[PDB]
Amino acid sequence: MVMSLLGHYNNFFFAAHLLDIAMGVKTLRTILSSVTHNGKQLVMTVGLLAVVVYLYTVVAFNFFRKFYNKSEDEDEPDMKCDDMMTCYLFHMYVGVRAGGGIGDEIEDPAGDEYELYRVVFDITFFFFVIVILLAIIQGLIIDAFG
Amino acid sequence: KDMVVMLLSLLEGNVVNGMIARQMVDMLVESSSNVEMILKFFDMFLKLKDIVGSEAFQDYVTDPRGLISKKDFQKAMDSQKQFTGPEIQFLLSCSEADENEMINFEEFANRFQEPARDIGFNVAVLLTNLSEHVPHDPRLRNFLELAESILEYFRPYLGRIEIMGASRRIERIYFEISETNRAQWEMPQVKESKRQFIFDVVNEGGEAEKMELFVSFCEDTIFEMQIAAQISEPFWGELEVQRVKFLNYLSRNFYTLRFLALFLAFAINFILLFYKVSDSPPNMVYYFLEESTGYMEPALWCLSLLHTLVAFLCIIGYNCLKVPLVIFKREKELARKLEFDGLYITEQPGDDDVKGQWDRLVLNTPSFPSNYWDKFVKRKVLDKHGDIFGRERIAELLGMDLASLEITAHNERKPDPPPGLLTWLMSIDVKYQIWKFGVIFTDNSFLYLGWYMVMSLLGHYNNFFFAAHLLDIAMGVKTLRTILSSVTHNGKQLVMTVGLLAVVVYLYTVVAFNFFRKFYNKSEDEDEPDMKCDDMMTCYLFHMYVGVRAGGGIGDEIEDPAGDEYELYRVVFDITFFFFVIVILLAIIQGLIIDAFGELRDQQEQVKEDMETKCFICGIGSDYFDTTPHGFETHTLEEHNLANYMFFLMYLINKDETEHTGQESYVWKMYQERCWDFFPAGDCFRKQYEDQLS
Amino acid sequence: GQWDRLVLNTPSFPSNYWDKFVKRKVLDKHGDIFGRERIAELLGMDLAS
Amino acid sequence: ELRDQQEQVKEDMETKCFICGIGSDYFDTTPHGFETHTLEEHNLANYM
Ligand SMILES: Nc1ncnc2c1ncn2[C@@H]1O[C@H](COP(=O)(O)OP(=O)(O)OP(=O)(O)O)[C@@H](O)[C@H]1O
Ligand SMILES: Nc1ncnc2c1ncn2[C@@H]1O[C@H](COP(=O)(O)OP(=O)(O)OP(=O)(O)O)[C@@H](O)[C@H]1O
Ligand SMILES: CC(C)Cn1c(=O)n(C)c(=O)c2nc[nH]c21
Ligand SMILES: [Ca+2]
Ligand SMILES: [Zn+2]
Ligand SMILES: [Zn+2]
Structure with a gap:
């Protein structure tokens, strides 16, 4: 969730969610x-x-x-x-x-x-x-x- | 206690549901009331000891001197609720209450503990033996329930093994275990030694020599316990006592020093990363540190000196802690070869055995069995081999004076010499020292540490030699x-x-x-x-x-x-x-x-799986025992615990020979003869009495 | 073990775990030796209640 | 494969009599039974 919120700040943080x-x-x-x-x-x-x-x-x-x-x-x-x-x-x-x-x-x-x-x-x-x-x-x- | 010992002797060789055991049970039933009185005495005082330590009891204590009045003591008893009114009155009577009615509960509790311990232990042993040999008797469970507290108290101290006796039958043996022995066994170093021994014998150990290996392990562990006890902590003489204190501190903290040396090596090599080379001083190159503070170079110097010091301290700690075991084992194997194999009497080493050639030196030396206990092996070897090989020849080989031998037994000679440095020097045995030092230099760990130290000294010459210490x-x-x-x-x-x-x-x-x-x-x-x-x-x-x-x-x-x-x-x-x-x-x-x-990996797995599936002693599988619930672990904790077998050997050694029972004498003689037949193999008490037990 | 100290004296200790009477069981088992008032203080119990 | 071959040979020879095929457990019912069996009763060198 924190990484998703950070993705809203910079969309490239949404890549960490692929580790799931x-x-x-x-x-x-x-x-x-x-x-x-x-x-x-x-x-x-x-x-x-x-x-x-x-x-x-x-x-x-x-x-x-x-x-x-x-x-x-x-x-x-x-x-x-x-x-x-x-x-x-x-x-x-x-x-x-x-x-x-x-x-x-x-x-x-x-x-x-x-x-x-x-x-x-x-x-x-x-x-x-x-x-x-x-x-x-x-x-x-x-x-x-x- | 002596009467109970007589009863226990009557029960020697007793079989399950034996007539003598049943007679004992009937006599106890006849004497029930007094047996109950005795058990109640023991359990009451055992419970008083714990109650007085209970803080709830300390709440009732309101006197700075630590005394408690009779009324307040009575209230504490009724609060704990374990005791009855008559029991509390009896305790009050046994209390040495002053005119002020004030009691020293500490001394009151401590009064009857030591006097009654041996009788308590022997009563517990009697009850355990009787229960295990008459398993089905309601008259015995009443006494056992009454003796509950005694049995729980003496459980860690009640040792239990099984042997093959002279009767060609498995016999259970009950003995006493000392707190100090149990603690020394539970020390971590003994645990590591045990694990290593188990791994070795299970992976590359022969079944025939398993018991000999186990007894050797027990002997070495006993020697290690002695060394640990000695180094443990609670003007020439003052210097000497300071020396032994310092050496024992080093021995105790040996491993800490090794870790510290490794830490210093890491610090030094972290510093060395800052060196740089320039043509100019800060056609010859110059190596110099590159830091802003300027404090690093003195730190490097200090760390180097301290690292060398710690290496020296590690050498001394090893020499004080570990070497004695090396010498003990080397002396022991030499002595057993001499007595039982006649190595230098009949066979002679192959001349490819450098250890066999080196061991020649110490034979004629007076101090040969310095660390190894048996001081009479030379005499034993003489008595065993002299008629064949020549008594004078044996004496020449072993540095023995036949004339002095007989006179020493005839009458005591005590030529006490005054202590002097010169007298000490003359007393030095150069040949034993040379043999010993060869053994030490051959020892690999000592060599590693000496190399460590030499590399530190070389680091002082050129600091980059301190990098080799990182291989540690x-x-x-x-x-x-x-x-x-x-x-x-x-x-x-x-x-x-x-x-x-x-x-x-x-x-x-x-x-x-x-x-x-x-x-x-x-x-x-x-x-x-x-x-x-x-x-x-x-x-x-x-x-x-x-x-x-x-x-x-x-x-x-x-x-x-x-x-x-x-x-x-x-x-x-x-x-x-x-x-x-x-x-x-x-x-x-x-x-x-x-x-x-x-x-x-499969070695470790195999060791684990053997230990979980077989008894290390009898070799019987877990399936037979698990026929009865929890059978295998009951077997390995109570019936055939190897720790108990070692405890039994310690107890035998510390016990006088006149007081040994028939069983203890049997096992002691077999130990002396180095026969391992008493160890049960392929048999157990349960299997022997299977039909009766079931 | 240190963290679990907090909830001992709390009324809601066995909220999800079924046994609601464990405090009483512990008192009955250990009070004679350890002090009933001490157990009650530790477990947030009112003996009179 | 070579390692487990050697291990299997060792382990068969240590657990069974090369002649009768009976396991070491039966013999070890009596102490030292298997090696007494393989040295005295059913030694193949003695058969030769
Ligand atoms: N005769 C025996 N005596 C003791 N242990 C035996 C014996 N035969 C087999 N074993 C196995 O040896 C193991 C020894 O148990 P123990 O708990 O003392 O050792 P451990 O696993 O090294 O643990 P610890 O940390 O307590 O030293 C047990 O798993 C037991 O199954
Ligand atoms: N019938 C049998 N005869 C001989 N050995 C047998 C027999 N059955 C099983 N064995 C096993 O065979 C092995 C033979 O023992 P032996 O010491 O002769 O051989 P080794 O291990 O090759 O040693 P060595 O160096 O003495 O030749 C023993 O481990 C024994 O367990
Ligand atoms: C280990 C050793 C110092 C103690 N020790 C021992 O192990 N065995 C077997 C003895 O017979 C013996 N006799 C005295 N001390 C002995
Ligand atoms: Ca006697
Ligand atoms: Zn066993
Ligand atoms: Zn066979």
Whole structure:
């Protein structure tokens, strides 16, 4: 009701009333209950993901700042890891969303003294973050169905 | 009480509707009036104790000194209405009323409680035994109703088990349970230990060794109760008492310190987000905080120091609280191996058992059974194995002086030395300390805490090492621990899946190095080519690095083959790489994780369902018991409660051997011999007396 | 449990729930021990009425 | 499917005699009955 009254003020608030399909339909309610069943576990999986990304951000801030320029123009560099907060935001935002991880979004290390360190960095980010934790989320949902 | 004990002994071995029990009931009927008088005495004083605590009674109290007059006491009694006029007069007579007619109801109530408790307990035991062995007798229910208050009062303290006796028949045993023992059992840590033990024995436990495992659990829990009691709270000596107080406070608050350390780690890592790097001071880079206040850096320093301090306190708390159990168990298993297996006497460790080699050191040490109770195991081993293996050999192995042995029994020697620091140092047993410290360093939790501390110290050198302390959320939180355990469950399988992936990529790299080098140029500038497969190592690195990470595989990252003589070969190459590597093996990883979730879930379900369907002791199913209403839970709370079995062992240990009954002596001897036949298996009192009971 | 304290002394306590005499039952059961006047004060009861 | 196959084999062998097919409950009526049965009475190694 409050959202309807707010819709009278701005009609786009009437969209929230479409979420009632969950309560109306038993099937959607069951599907959502599958998610809610292990919701606390999913939340803590997300927290663990954040911790892992924070550790990776710390490593990058210490050793791999040079690779985090996202500016094509040499005159105006845009460095995403000169500050720890920016580096963390960059990781959690782009690397998690990327298929191959942060290595997909940061500058190639070929012909660099830290090339092997960074390949380990990228591949470990990819497996742990992208593969395993996400896999854990799907597995939680599947186990809820069962 | 002694007379009642004689009667209870007469009832040893009694069967349902036995002649001796029926004779007892007839005698009680003959003596009804006096039995009623005794029961009324007990119940009247039991009710007085609660009434005086009742605030409604306190309303009648109008004297600052806490005394109550006889008339006001009489009015309080008639208000509560439990007592009759004659009963109130009797209580008034028993009241030590002064010339002012004023009474100390506190001492009046407390006077007869302790003296009459043992007789009350034994009367309750007698009535319970008689009722359970003559279930159908109206003359007994009258006495039981009169004894109601006694039975309700002593219910938490009346322990009840079943054993297989010498008569080849199930026998019920009644004993006393102490308040302290019950409280210690109800402490949450014992509950967690119980749950863990149940899970382990039900999921990966053998039926044959179930009872041995249960007795080991009981022993360890008793030792833990001792430790908890010791650390519980109500100039060199002053220093010593302060030391023990501080250590016990640490032991009591161990977990709080761990939570606090985690909180400090989170605070430090929240602060560390504000660091920034500049070429200039606020060719060398400088890391510095970025805040307006300027108060954060000192806060970081203080939090770091306090975090390190808390890590130290956690090390000490663990060493004081948890280590004693480790040593107790290690000593116990060693002693039982020596006595019952003859490990270092006959078999000898396989030499692949590092623990078996390490345990050699402490055998000859005087302090060997320091934490484990049995101080005479060396003597037992000698008596058992000396005739065969050589008494002098056993004594040499176990650090025993045969001549000193006999004289110690012949006559007491008490060579008290004055306390001194030097004397203490000489008393130190270096070999026992070395063995112990090896055990501790091998203990995983101690290692984790030591690493925690080392990382804190390193954080003081470079504050970014404080981030590793955030990994402790796994140990702190049960949910994350379970989630991680799902991964660890099939960890070896996952590792080998990764190795297989590497092999497949190596084969693809070999094929590319042979036939498809032209396509592996990643340089847009024709003048400077960057070829990633002119060397096999570079080609392998390229594949494992980019192709695996790519969604469509290596074909996404290498040059299109359209209009080339090897176009179809390469499309097969790329598509097969994509399906095998990207789809299947990764799918295998997800499937492993999902199967781990299901496996943990069905383990928990199976434990729950076994415990709800079977008696942990006899193994009989819930259906037989539920033939009678509420039968299974009555069985698990009264007949075959495992907590009562542990209570019985504590009671046996604390009781003198001369006072043990035949049943208690039987079970005590079987405990000493480590025979578990007294535990009922596939049989119960109900099943044995089924026809008579029904 | 804290919120339910309010309605104990209210006359309309068992408005929807059928048992209108529970206050009396509680008095008869617990008054001898806990104080009849105390129970009546808690449950909004007038003993004389 | 592979997991529940292994579990089923384990659980059949722990609950039944491979020879007579009688369940562990009958034997456990007597203490240690099933393992006495499978080690002494109906050991398949002894049949070989
Ligand atoms: N011999 C036995 N002794 C005790 N419990 C048994 C026994 N056999 C089976 N059980 C089952 O064990 C469970 C133990 O009950 P209890 O309430 O003490 O444990 P719980 O579920 O862990 O709860 P709590 O929070 O009270 O510790 C009961 O469900 C009972 O069905
Ligand atoms: N007739 C039978 N003969 C032998 N074992 C039987 C029989 N019926 C059931 N079993 C089960 O088969 C299992 C065989 O026991 P055994 O210890 O020989 O095998 P195992 O688990 O493969 O161990 P091991 O490492 O000793 O070979 C036991 O668990 C027993 O419960
Ligand atoms: C746990 C232990 C310290 C107590 N404890 C024990 O468990 N058992 C089995 C005994 O025989 C024994 N004898 C003394 N103390 C004993
Ligand atoms: Ca005696
Ligand atoms: Zn049982
Ligand atoms: Zn058989």
